[PDB]
Amino acid sequence: MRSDNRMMGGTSYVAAEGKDKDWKVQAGANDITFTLKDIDGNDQTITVNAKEG
Amino acid sequence: VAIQEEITALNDELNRIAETTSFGGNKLLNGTFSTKSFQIGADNGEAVMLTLKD
C-alpha cells in the first residue's frame, strides 16, 4: 500500500500540439480511436467520434 | 493643445488601469492573462477556458 506501488498509478500519454483557445474540432478530423487491452486482457477499441466546433 | 493635454493624461490612465488591475498580484488586463481554464467538476477535464484580452 506504498505510494510507489504500480497498481497505485498508471500511464500518462500527453499530446505535442498546444491547441489554443481558438482551435476547434475540424469537421474532417472528428475521431480518436483508442486501441487498448483491458486489465483483464480483453481487447477494446474505443472510437470517440468528437463533435466539430 | 489644452484638450490634447487632458486626452494624453487620460490615455495614460487607460494604460495604468490595464497595467495595475490585479487579482491578488495576477495582473488581469496586460495581455498576460492568456486563456486559462477554471476546473468546475469533481472528475478531471471538466473546465471552461476564460480569456482576458489586453
Side-chain angles (χ1 to χ4, degrees):
Chain A
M1 237 41 79
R2 278 196 41 116
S3 180
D4 54 2
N5 182 60
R6 189 191 53 61
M7 259 297 119
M8 276 282 210
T11 314
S12 168
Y13 309 71
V14 185
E17 313 295 356
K19 306 306 187 181
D20 79 300
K21 63 177 185 62
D22 299 302
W23 175 90
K24 297 167 56 180
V25 176
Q26 291 79 4
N30 50 359
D31 54 302
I32 181 170
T33 291
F34 297 120
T35 317
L36 38 81
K37 163 183 303 179
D38 201 300
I39 184 187
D40 325 304
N42 65 69
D43 295 2
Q44 308 294 298
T45 305
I46 318 172
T47 304
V48 179
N49 294 301
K51 301 179 170 302
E52 168 261 0
Chain B
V1 168
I3 308 179
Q4 176 56 59
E5 177 55 61
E6 173 157 58
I7 291 190
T8 315
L10 293 195
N11 184 60
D12 289 358
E13 194 44 59
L14 292 173
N15 295 299
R16 198 201 62 62
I17 306 281
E19 289 300 301
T20 55
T21 304
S22 59
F23 187 62
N26 183 4
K27 295 297 173 302
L28 299 183
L29 299 186
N30 47 352
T32 64
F33 200 113
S34 61
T35 167
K36 290 183 189 182
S37 305
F38 293 66
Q39 174 68 5
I40 48 166
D43 303 300
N44 67 359
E46 313 188 1
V48 176
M49 277 172 331
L50 168 69
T51 315
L52 273 69
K53 327 172 187 301
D54 172 60

XYZ file of all heavy atoms in Angstrom:
806
model
N 0.864 -1.208 0.000
C 0.000 0.000 0.000
C 0.890 1.245 0.000
O 0.404 2.312 0.413
C -0.910 0.022 1.231
C -2.385 0.090 0.892
S -2.828 -0.963 -0.510
C -2.899 -2.564 0.290
N 2.139 1.109 -0.450
C 3.029 2.295 -0.548
C 2.567 3.165 -1.720
O 1.778 2.670 -2.544
C 4.488 1.873 -0.724
C 5.192 1.499 0.570
C 6.689 1.494 0.339
N 7.068 2.623 -0.496
C 7.852 3.619 -0.105
N 8.285 3.667 1.142
N 8.192 4.568 -0.959
N 3.060 4.402 -1.800
C 2.603 5.342 -2.856
C 3.330 5.070 -4.177
O 2.955 5.689 -5.191
C 2.806 6.759 -2.407
O 2.367 7.671 -3.399
N 4.329 4.188 -4.161
C 5.123 3.912 -5.385
C 4.581 2.655 -6.068
O 5.016 2.364 -7.196
C 6.611 3.793 -5.054
C 6.910 2.774 -3.967
O 5.958 2.129 -3.489
O 8.094 2.640 -3.602
N 3.668 1.942 -5.405
C 3.107 0.687 -5.970
C 2.597 0.960 -7.388
O 1.955 2.003 -7.592
C 2.017 0.102 -5.075
C 1.465 -1.203 -5.604
O 2.201 -2.173 -5.766
N 0.173 -1.235 -5.880
N 2.873 0.054 -8.326
C 2.474 0.268 -9.743
C 0.950 0.367 -9.835
O 0.459 1.280 -10.525
C 2.990 -0.882 -10.610
C 2.822 -0.658 -12.105
C 3.103 -1.920 -12.895
N 2.311 -3.038 -12.404
C 0.984 -3.075 -12.389
N 0.293 -2.402 -13.292
N 0.353 -3.794 -11.477
N 0.232 -0.537 -9.167
C -1.253 -0.534 -9.226
C -1.770 0.819 -8.732
O -2.887 1.199 -9.126
C -1.839 -1.637 -8.343
C -2.274 -2.868 -9.109
S -3.615 -2.516 -10.271
C -2.828 -2.948 -11.822
N -0.988 1.510 -7.902
C -1.440 2.798 -7.316
C -1.491 3.869 -8.410
O -1.994 4.969 -8.121
C -0.487 3.260 -6.213
C -0.767 2.638 -4.862
S -2.179 3.397 -4.024
C -1.704 3.168 -2.313
N -0.986 3.568 -9.610
C -0.933 4.596 -10.669
C -1.279 4.062 -12.046
O -2.106 3.136 -12.128
N -0.682 4.642 -13.094
C -0.960 4.218 -14.479
C -0.007 4.875 -15.460
O 1.119 5.205 -15.049
N -0.440 5.067 -16.709
C 0.445 5.645 -17.755
C -0.121 6.985 -18.231
O -1.339 7.055 -18.447
C 0.612 4.656 -18.911
O 0.873 3.369 -18.350
C 1.729 5.038 -19.855
N 0.732 7.998 -18.394
C 0.247 9.350 -18.775
C 0.666 9.694 -20.204
O 1.816 10.129 -20.388
C 0.750 10.390 -17.818
O 0.529 11.693 -18.331
N -0.245 9.527 -21.165
C 0.055 9.874 -22.578
C -0.270 11.348 -22.771
O -1.380 11.770 -22.395
C -0.729 8.982 -23.542
C -0.633 7.483 -23.298
C -1.241 6.892 -22.199
C 0.071 6.663 -24.170
C -1.160 5.528 -21.978
C 0.162 5.298 -23.960
C -0.456 4.730 -22.860
O -0.371 3.388 -22.641
N 0.670 12.115 -23.323
C 0.468 13.584 -23.488
C 0.589 13.929 -24.971
O 1.411 13.296 -25.655
C 1.485 14.386 -22.658
C 1.208 15.880 -22.712
C 1.535 13.906 -21.215
N -0.198 14.897 -25.443
C -0.112 15.336 -26.852
C 1.097 16.255 -27.024
O 1.721 16.606 -26.007
C -1.379 16.046 -27.239
N 1.404 16.629 -28.267
C 2.537 17.543 -28.530
C 2.014 18.849 -29.129
O 2.785 19.821 -29.189
C 3.507 16.872 -29.460
N 0.751 18.869 -29.552
C 0.208 20.075 -30.230
C -0.550 20.939 -29.218
O -1.621 20.507 -28.755
C -0.676 19.646 -31.400
C -0.032 18.576 -32.261
C 1.225 18.998 -33.004
O 1.591 20.188 -32.931
O 1.843 18.130 -33.647
N -0.015 22.123 -28.912
C -0.649 23.013 -27.925
C -1.810 23.775 -28.530
O -1.650 24.981 -28.789
N -2.940 23.095 -28.741
C -4.141 23.747 -29.322
C -4.502 24.961 -28.464
O -4.501 24.823 -27.229
C -5.296 22.748 -29.376
C -4.989 21.440 -30.091
C -4.444 21.640 -31.485
C -4.309 20.343 -32.251
N -3.746 20.562 -33.604
N -4.800 26.099 -29.096
C -5.072 27.344 -28.330
C -6.572 27.481 -28.070
O -7.313 26.523 -28.349
C -4.555 28.578 -29.069
C -5.475 29.029 -30.187
O -5.713 28.228 -31.112
O -5.964 30.169 -30.109
N -6.998 28.644 -27.572
C -8.432 28.880 -27.269
C -9.232 28.950 -28.571
O -10.468 28.835 -28.503
C -8.593 30.207 -26.527
C -8.170 31.432 -27.326
C -8.407 32.736 -26.603
C -8.102 33.946 -27.459
N -8.972 33.999 -28.659
N -8.554 29.141 -29.704
C -9.288 29.321 -30.984
C -9.326 28.001 -31.759
O -10.199 27.861 -32.633
C -8.681 30.457 -31.810
C -8.731 31.796 -31.098
O -9.846 32.230 -30.750
O -7.657 32.394 -30.898
N -8.428 27.067 -31.444
C -8.504 25.751 -32.123
C -9.868 25.128 -31.845
O -10.296 25.123 -30.674
C -7.383 24.807 -31.671
C -7.520 23.431 -32.265
C -6.986 22.988 -33.439
C -8.270 22.323 -31.722
N -7.338 21.683 -33.659
C -8.127 21.250 -32.626
C -9.040 22.136 -30.569
C -8.724 20.011 -32.407
C -9.631 20.912 -30.356
C -9.475 19.867 -31.264
N -10.523 24.620 -32.888
C -11.828 23.937 -32.708
C -11.767 22.601 -33.448
O -11.040 22.520 -34.451
C -12.963 24.810 -33.248
C -13.151 26.141 -32.535
C -14.064 27.090 -33.278
C -15.428 26.497 -33.564
N -16.295 27.449 -34.297
N -12.505 21.600 -32.972
C -12.542 20.302 -33.700
C -12.896 20.597 -35.157
O -13.984 21.149 -35.396
C -13.552 19.326 -33.072
C -13.661 18.038 -33.874
C -13.217 19.025 -31.623
N -12.003 20.252 -36.087
C -12.312 20.433 -37.528
C -13.243 19.296 -37.955
O -13.075 18.178 -37.434
C -11.028 20.460 -38.358
C -10.178 21.702 -38.124
C -9.359 21.635 -36.859
O -9.352 20.632 -36.149
N -8.648 22.713 -36.568
N -14.176 19.568 -38.867
C -15.170 18.541 -39.257
C -14.460 17.280 -39.754
O -14.902 16.176 -39.390
C -16.089 19.102 -40.311
N -13.408 17.439 -40.560
C -12.714 16.267 -41.128
C -12.118 15.388 -40.044
O -12.336 14.163 -40.091
N -11.397 15.989 -39.096
C -10.741 15.212 -38.021
C -11.646 15.182 -36.786
O -11.448 16.024 -35.891
C -9.405 15.827 -37.702
N -12.595 14.246 -36.744
C -13.545 14.170 -35.604
C -13.586 12.734 -35.079
O -14.694 12.241 -34.813
C -14.938 14.666 -35.995
C -15.458 14.031 -37.266
O -14.774 13.220 -37.886
N -16.663 14.400 -37.666
N -12.421 12.095 -34.952
C -12.365 10.687 -34.482
C -11.028 10.442 -33.778
O -9.992 10.870 -34.318
C -12.563 9.715 -35.645
C -11.597 9.960 -36.791
O -11.600 11.084 -37.328
O -10.849 9.025 -37.132
N -11.059 9.773 -32.623
C -9.796 9.440 -31.902
C -9.921 8.013 -31.354
O -10.159 7.841 -30.145
C -9.479 10.501 -30.826
C -8.177 10.192 -30.080
C -10.651 10.705 -29.875
C -7.705 11.316 -29.189
N -9.772 7.022 -32.234
C -9.923 5.606 -31.812
C -8.888 5.275 -30.735
O -7.692 5.526 -30.968
C -9.785 4.670 -33.015
O -10.923 4.867 -33.854
C -9.682 3.215 -32.618
N -9.340 4.727 -29.606
C -8.411 4.324 -28.523
C -8.276 2.802 -28.533
O -9.180 2.119 -28.019
C -8.937 4.787 -27.165
C -9.046 6.281 -27.010
C -10.268 6.879 -26.755
C -7.926 7.086 -27.119
C -10.367 8.254 -26.613
C -8.026 8.460 -26.975
C -9.246 9.041 -26.723
N -7.188 2.292 -29.110
C -6.952 0.826 -29.104
C -6.190 0.453 -27.831
O -5.081 0.978 -27.644
C -6.183 0.388 -30.353
O -6.738 1.077 -31.474
C -6.237 -1.107 -30.581
N -6.764 -0.414 -26.994
C -6.122 -0.763 -25.700
C -6.590 -2.147 -25.245
O -7.588 -2.643 -25.798
C -6.500 0.306 -24.673
C -7.928 0.843 -24.776
C -8.918 -0.098 -24.111
C -8.028 2.230 -24.165
N -5.882 -2.741 -24.284
C -6.271 -4.073 -23.749
C -6.690 -3.907 -22.287
O -5.907 -3.324 -21.515
C -5.106 -5.055 -23.871
C -5.230 -6.310 -23.020
C -4.030 -7.220 -23.125
C -3.739 -7.639 -24.550
N -2.542 -8.507 -24.630
N -7.868 -4.415 -21.925
C -8.381 -4.233 -20.543
C -7.421 -4.894 -19.554
O -6.695 -5.818 -19.962
C -9.787 -4.815 -20.394
C -10.563 -4.250 -19.219
O -10.088 -4.397 -18.078
O -11.641 -3.671 -19.456
N -7.444 -4.452 -18.294
C -6.588 -5.092 -17.252
C -6.864 -6.599 -17.277
O -5.909 -7.375 -17.089
C -6.841 -4.476 -15.861
C -5.896 -5.060 -14.808
C -8.298 -4.619 -15.450
C -6.200 -4.625 -13.396
N -8.116 -6.988 -17.524
C -8.472 -8.427 -17.607
C -7.697 -9.069 -18.759
O -7.265 -10.225 -18.601
C -9.975 -8.617 -17.802
C -10.807 -7.583 -17.065
O -10.644 -7.472 -15.835
O -11.617 -6.905 -17.727
N -7.534 -8.347 -19.871
C -6.848 -8.906 -21.052
C -7.724 -8.790 -22.285
O -7.182 -8.844 -23.403
N -9.036 -8.640 -22.087
C -9.979 -8.467 -23.221
C -9.559 -7.224 -24.009
O -9.057 -6.272 -23.386
C -11.434 -8.425 -22.744
C -11.760 -7.227 -21.878
O -11.784 -6.095 -22.355
N -12.056 -7.468 -20.612
N -9.733 -7.249 -25.333
C -9.283 -6.111 -26.176
C -10.464 -5.178 -26.441
O -11.560 -5.680 -26.733
C -8.641 -6.598 -27.476
C -7.350 -7.364 -27.248
O -6.982 -7.550 -26.073
O -6.719 -7.756 -28.248
N -10.232 -3.871 -26.334
C -11.319 -2.887 -26.555
C -10.844 -1.832 -27.554
O -9.669 -1.435 -27.478
C -11.704 -2.218 -25.238
C -12.012 -3.203 -24.120
C -13.255 -4.008 -24.408
O -14.350 -3.465 -24.539
N -13.093 -5.316 -24.504
N -11.726 -1.409 -28.457
C -11.380 -0.327 -29.410
C -12.398 0.794 -29.211
O -13.532 0.652 -29.698
C -11.338 -0.859 -30.845
O -10.435 -1.965 -30.871
C -10.896 0.184 -31.847
N -12.011 1.850 -28.495
C -12.966 2.949 -28.176
C -12.847 4.039 -29.242
O -11.862 4.795 -29.199
C -12.675 3.510 -26.773
C -12.375 2.394 -25.768
C -13.809 4.408 -26.305
C -11.903 2.893 -24.424
N -13.820 4.121 -30.153
C -13.808 5.210 -31.164
C -14.628 6.390 -30.644
O -15.864 6.278 -30.618
C -14.358 4.732 -32.510
O -13.592 3.600 -32.922
C -14.306 5.802 -33.577
N -13.962 7.473 -30.244
C -14.693 8.688 -29.785
C -14.843 9.633 -30.977
O -13.911 10.421 -31.226
C -13.966 9.368 -28.610
C -14.692 10.622 -28.149
C -13.773 8.409 -27.446
N -15.963 9.543 -31.696
C -16.201 10.494 -32.813
C -16.499 11.856 -32.197
O -17.673 12.104 -31.877
C -17.327 10.030 -33.732
C -16.975 8.764 -34.481
O -15.998 8.730 -35.225
N -17.762 7.718 -34.288
N -15.474 12.699 -32.052
C -15.649 14.029 -31.423
C -16.620 14.884 -32.242
O -16.933 14.504 -33.386
C -14.310 14.706 -31.291
N -17.054 16.016 -31.683
C -18.054 16.871 -32.376
C -17.375 18.133 -32.915
O -16.769 18.862 -32.113
C -19.200 17.187 -31.413
C -19.918 15.959 -30.870
C -21.031 16.283 -29.905
C -21.879 15.076 -29.569
N -22.472 14.472 -30.785
N -17.518 18.386 -34.218
C -16.893 19.574 -34.858
C -17.256 20.841 -34.080
O -18.413 20.947 -33.635
C -17.351 19.671 -36.315
C -17.007 20.990 -36.981
C -18.146 21.995 -37.023
O -19.242 21.664 -36.530
O -17.935 23.103 -37.551
N -16.303 21.763 -33.935
C -16.599 23.045 -33.272
C -16.201 23.037 -31.810
O -16.261 24.109 -31.181
N -4.590 72.409 -27.937
C -3.422 71.979 -27.117
C -3.925 71.630 -25.715
O -3.537 70.570 -25.190
C -2.344 73.074 -27.071
C -1.292 72.788 -26.012
C -1.694 73.278 -28.430
N -4.757 72.497 -25.140
C -5.318 72.213 -23.804
C -6.024 70.856 -23.842
O -5.684 69.984 -23.021
C -6.264 73.315 -23.407
N -6.975 70.695 -24.759
C -7.745 69.422 -24.826
C -6.747 68.268 -24.923
O -6.874 67.309 -24.139
C -8.719 69.452 -26.019
C -9.581 70.716 -26.003
C -9.565 68.190 -26.060
C -10.548 70.815 -27.155
N -5.771 68.373 -25.827
C -4.832 67.241 -26.041
C -4.163 66.903 -24.711
O -4.017 65.710 -24.410
C -3.782 67.583 -27.094
C -2.739 66.494 -27.287
C -3.382 65.175 -27.634
O -4.096 65.057 -28.626
N -3.145 64.172 -26.805
N -3.781 67.926 -23.951
C -3.084 67.675 -22.668
C -3.925 66.689 -21.856
O -3.371 65.671 -21.400
C -2.889 68.985 -21.909
C -2.245 68.795 -20.550
C -0.917 68.061 -20.598
O 0.016 68.575 -21.245
O -0.823 66.975 -19.994
N -5.221 66.967 -21.715
C -6.103 66.074 -20.922
C -6.194 64.710 -21.613
O -6.107 63.690 -20.912
C -7.495 66.682 -20.749
C -8.478 65.732 -20.091
C -9.661 66.383 -19.394
O -10.413 67.119 -20.062
O -9.834 66.143 -18.183
N -6.361 64.699 -22.935
C -6.532 63.409 -23.663
C -5.279 62.562 -23.430
O -5.427 61.358 -23.171
C -6.813 63.650 -25.157
C -8.193 64.278 -25.362
C -6.655 62.368 -25.958
C -8.638 64.329 -26.801
N -4.099 63.183 -23.479
C -2.838 62.446 -23.215
C -2.880 61.890 -21.796
O -2.544 60.708 -21.609
C -1.619 63.359 -23.364
O -1.776 64.121 -24.561
C -0.316 62.593 -23.406
N -3.285 62.719 -20.837
C -3.329 62.281 -19.427
C -4.316 61.119 -19.282
O -3.982 60.140 -18.596
C -3.712 63.442 -18.552
N -5.488 61.232 -19.907
C -6.493 60.141 -19.836
C -5.926 58.909 -20.541
O -6.107 57.798 -20.023
C -7.794 60.598 -20.496
C -8.536 61.725 -19.780
C -9.962 61.839 -20.292
C -8.526 61.507 -18.276
N -5.247 59.109 -21.671
C -4.619 57.960 -22.365
C -3.761 57.215 -21.346
O -3.819 55.974 -21.308
C -3.785 58.391 -23.570
C -3.216 57.215 -24.332
O -3.962 56.377 -24.832
N -1.899 57.142 -24.418
N -3.009 57.960 -20.540
C -2.133 57.318 -19.529
C -3.019 56.525 -18.573
O -2.665 55.381 -18.251
C -1.260 58.345 -18.807
C -0.159 58.914 -19.686
O -0.057 58.480 -20.849
O 0.586 59.787 -19.202
N -4.144 57.105 -18.165
C -4.997 56.417 -17.163
C -5.408 55.062 -17.740
O -5.289 54.058 -17.025
C -6.208 57.270 -16.791
C -6.917 56.787 -15.541
C -5.990 56.420 -14.395
O -5.231 57.296 -13.943
O -6.030 55.258 -13.958
N -5.840 55.045 -18.998
C -6.291 53.772 -19.607
C -5.172 52.752 -19.411
O -5.451 51.671 -18.865
C -6.545 54.004 -21.095
C -7.728 54.908 -21.435
C -7.761 55.199 -22.925
C -9.031 54.264 -20.997
N -3.948 53.113 -19.793
C -2.808 52.162 -19.710
C -2.536 51.791 -18.248
O -2.206 50.624 -17.986
C -1.573 52.729 -20.411
C -1.780 52.903 -21.900
O -2.029 51.935 -22.615
N -1.677 54.133 -22.377
N -2.669 52.752 -17.337
C -2.412 52.477 -15.902
C -3.443 51.464 -15.396
O -3.040 50.509 -14.715
C -2.485 53.766 -15.085
C -1.825 53.664 -13.720
C -2.361 54.737 -12.797
N -3.790 54.590 -12.558
C -4.358 53.544 -11.968
N -3.621 52.663 -11.318
N -5.668 53.392 -12.021
N -4.722 51.681 -15.706
C -5.771 50.700 -15.302
C -5.331 49.322 -15.793
O -5.356 48.372 -14.990
C -7.145 51.081 -15.886
C -7.548 52.513 -15.528
C -8.206 50.078 -15.460
C -8.082 52.665 -14.126
N -4.921 49.232 -17.058
C -4.560 47.922 -17.647
C -3.338 47.324 -16.948
O -3.332 46.099 -16.731
C -4.310 48.092 -19.123
N -2.343 48.146 -16.610
C -1.086 47.591 -16.040
C -1.214 47.401 -14.526
O -0.253 46.895 -13.922
C 0.092 48.507 -16.362
C 0.485 48.491 -17.827
C 0.910 47.129 -18.347
O 1.881 46.566 -17.805
O 0.268 46.636 -19.294
N -2.343 47.796 -13.936
C -2.466 47.711 -12.457
C -3.526 46.676 -12.072
O -3.316 45.975 -11.067
C -2.780 49.081 -11.850
O -3.945 49.589 -12.500
C -1.637 50.056 -12.003
N -4.620 46.592 -12.831
C -5.716 45.663 -12.451
C -5.099 44.304 -12.114
O -4.570 43.657 -13.038
C -6.757 45.549 -13.569
O -7.231 46.864 -13.859
C -7.916 44.652 -13.200
N -5.165 43.897 -10.846
C -4.524 42.625 -10.426
C -5.429 41.881 -9.443
O -5.865 42.504 -8.461
C -3.179 42.886 -9.814
O -3.301 43.736 -8.684
N -5.681 40.596 -9.695
C -6.494 39.787 -8.754
C -5.559 39.135 -7.733
O -5.404 37.902 -7.752
C -7.301 38.733 -9.513
C -8.282 37.971 -8.662
C -9.327 38.625 -8.031
C -8.149 36.605 -8.474
C -10.225 37.926 -7.243
C -9.046 35.908 -7.683
C -10.081 36.570 -7.067
N -4.938 39.949 -6.878
C -4.028 39.408 -5.852
C -2.602 39.322 -6.360
O -1.817 38.554 -5.780
N -2.281 40.086 -7.405
C -0.918 40.080 -7.964
C -0.899 39.483 -9.357
O 0.058 39.758 -10.100
N -1.922 38.697 -9.693
C -2.031 38.156 -11.069
C -2.660 39.247 -11.938
O -3.899 39.336 -11.963
C -2.852 36.868 -11.104
C -2.932 36.239 -12.479
O -2.308 36.713 -13.426
N -3.689 35.161 -12.594
N -1.823 40.074 -12.567
C -2.340 41.172 -13.422
C -3.391 40.581 -14.360
O -3.171 39.460 -14.857
C -1.190 41.834 -14.181
C -0.180 42.563 -13.307
C -0.785 43.720 -12.546
C 0.177 44.335 -11.553
N 0.661 43.334 -10.574
N -4.482 41.306 -14.605
C -5.587 40.719 -15.407
C -5.652 41.326 -16.812
O -6.003 40.580 -17.743
C -6.898 40.970 -14.658
C -6.998 40.343 -13.268
C -8.363 40.610 -12.656
C -6.733 38.848 -13.331
N -5.321 42.610 -16.975
C -5.528 43.247 -18.307
C -4.219 43.748 -18.927
O -4.245 44.835 -19.529
C -6.522 44.399 -18.134
C -7.906 43.992 -17.633
C -8.857 45.179 -17.638
C -8.470 42.856 -18.473
N -3.129 42.988 -18.816
C -1.879 43.392 -19.515
C -1.528 42.314 -20.543
O -0.328 42.072 -20.757
C -0.727 43.669 -18.549
C -0.567 42.597 -17.497
O -1.402 41.703 -17.383
N 0.495 42.691 -16.713
N -2.544 41.700 -21.153
C -2.317 40.652 -22.163
C -1.582 39.464 -21.573
O -1.175 38.583 -22.348
N -1.412 39.441 -20.249
C -0.652 38.344 -19.600
C -1.626 37.255 -19.149
O -1.187 36.102 -18.997
C 0.189 38.857 -18.427
O -0.706 39.364 -17.439
C 1.178 39.925 -18.840
N -2.894 37.612 -18.939
C -3.900 36.579 -18.582
C -4.300 35.839 -19.858
O -5.440 36.014 -20.330
C -5.103 37.192 -17.862
C -5.917 36.207 -17.061
C -5.953 36.280 -15.679
C -6.623 35.190 -17.683
C -6.692 35.372 -14.939
C -7.364 34.283 -16.942
C -7.398 34.375 -15.571
N -3.374 35.056 -20.412
C -3.695 34.240 -21.606
C -4.802 33.256 -21.235
O -4.930 32.941 -20.041
C -2.479 33.520 -22.081
O -1.996 32.644 -21.074
N -5.573 32.793 -22.219
C -6.701 31.867 -21.939
C -6.318 30.895 -20.817
O -5.315 30.173 -20.978
C -7.122 31.123 -23.212
O -7.981 30.051 -22.823
C -5.951 30.583 -24.002
N -7.089 30.877 -19.726
C -6.831 29.915 -18.623
C -8.109 29.119 -18.359
O -9.200 29.690 -18.526
C -6.404 30.646 -17.349
C -5.027 31.291 -17.389
C -4.632 31.932 -16.078
C -3.365 32.752 -16.183
N -2.980 33.336 -14.877
N -7.976 27.863 -17.932
C -9.164 27.011 -17.666
C -9.480 27.015 -16.170
O -8.531 26.973 -15.368
C -8.941 25.613 -18.164
O -8.578 25.618 -19.536
N -10.766 27.060 -15.817
C -11.161 27.001 -14.386
C -11.913 25.691 -14.141
O -13.018 25.528 -14.689
C -11.993 28.229 -14.009
C -11.239 29.535 -14.035
C -10.750 30.053 -15.223
C -11.004 30.239 -12.866
C -10.051 31.249 -15.243
C -10.307 31.436 -12.887
C -9.832 31.938 -14.074
N -11.329 24.787 -13.351
C -11.961 23.458 -13.133
C -13.316 23.642 -12.451
O -13.353 24.264 -11.377
C -11.065 22.549 -12.294
C -11.725 21.225 -11.928
C -11.950 20.320 -13.115
O -11.538 20.610 -14.236
N -12.597 19.192 -12.870
N -14.380 23.115 -13.057
C -15.743 23.203 -12.457
C -16.373 21.807 -12.447
O -17.516 21.677 -12.919
C -16.615 24.214 -13.223
C -16.550 23.995 -14.737
C -16.239 25.637 -12.848
C -17.621 24.733 -15.501
N -15.662 20.809 -11.918
C -16.220 19.445 -11.830
C -15.458 18.584 -10.843
O -14.297 18.913 -10.553
N -16.090 17.523 -10.341
C -15.427 16.616 -9.378
C -14.453 15.712 -10.131
O -13.390 15.388 -9.579
C -16.457 15.803 -8.647
N -14.825 15.310 -11.345
C -13.922 14.464 -12.165
C -12.976 15.388 -12.931
O -13.248 16.601 -12.974
C -14.718 13.527 -13.073
C -15.672 12.623 -12.310
O -15.188 11.844 -11.465
O -16.890 12.711 -12.561
N -11.909 14.836 -13.506
C -10.906 15.689 -14.189
C -11.428 16.126 -15.557
O -12.419 15.541 -16.024
C -9.562 14.973 -14.319
C -9.587 13.771 -15.241
O -10.622 13.429 -15.806
N -8.446 13.123 -15.399
N -10.792 17.129 -16.164
C -11.166 17.542 -17.530
C -12.558 18.128 -17.637
O -13.186 17.950 -18.693
N -13.030 18.808 -16.596
C -14.342 19.496 -16.697
C -14.086 20.980 -16.446
O -14.527 21.480 -15.398
C -15.341 18.922 -15.692
C -15.378 17.406 -15.672
C -16.496 16.812 -14.833
O -17.276 17.591 -14.255
O -16.586 15.570 -14.764
N -13.379 21.641 -17.364
C -13.015 23.059 -17.145
C -13.432 23.913 -18.342
O -13.415 23.393 -19.469
C -11.534 23.168 -16.900
N -13.796 25.172 -18.095
C -14.136 26.109 -19.203
C -12.969 27.089 -19.338
O -12.336 27.383 -18.312
C -15.459 26.837 -18.915
C -15.790 27.872 -19.979
C -16.608 25.857 -18.743
N -12.673 27.540 -20.557
C -11.496 28.422 -20.770
C -11.929 29.886 -20.678
O -12.869 30.266 -21.398
C -10.875 28.164 -22.144
C -9.934 26.979 -22.163
S -9.391 26.567 -23.837
C -10.809 27.118 -24.783
N -11.262 30.671 -19.830
C -11.572 32.122 -19.720
C -10.375 32.919 -20.243
O -9.252 32.682 -19.759
C -11.855 32.464 -18.256
C -11.920 33.954 -17.931
C -13.146 34.596 -18.560
C -11.910 34.183 -16.428
N -10.614 33.826 -21.193
C -9.513 34.632 -21.776
C -9.711 36.106 -21.425
O -10.795 36.638 -21.725
C -9.453 34.475 -23.298
O -9.592 33.087 -23.600
C -8.171 35.021 -23.888
N -8.702 36.735 -20.824
C -8.790 38.186 -20.522
C -7.943 38.939 -21.550
O -6.709 38.954 -21.398
C -8.298 38.431 -19.094
C -9.361 38.298 -18.006
C -9.800 36.852 -17.844
C -8.847 38.840 -16.683
N -8.591 39.538 -22.549
C -7.856 40.239 -23.633
C -7.111 41.448 -23.063
O -7.579 42.007 -22.055
C -8.841 40.701 -24.707
C -10.050 39.800 -24.916
C -11.083 40.404 -25.842
C -12.354 39.587 -25.928
N -12.089 38.207 -26.398
N -6.002 41.836 -23.697
C -5.246 43.036 -23.255
C -6.105 44.277 -23.498
O -6.641 44.412 -24.612
C -3.910 43.151 -23.986
C -3.189 44.457 -23.705
O -2.889 44.714 -22.523
O -2.939 45.205 -24.669
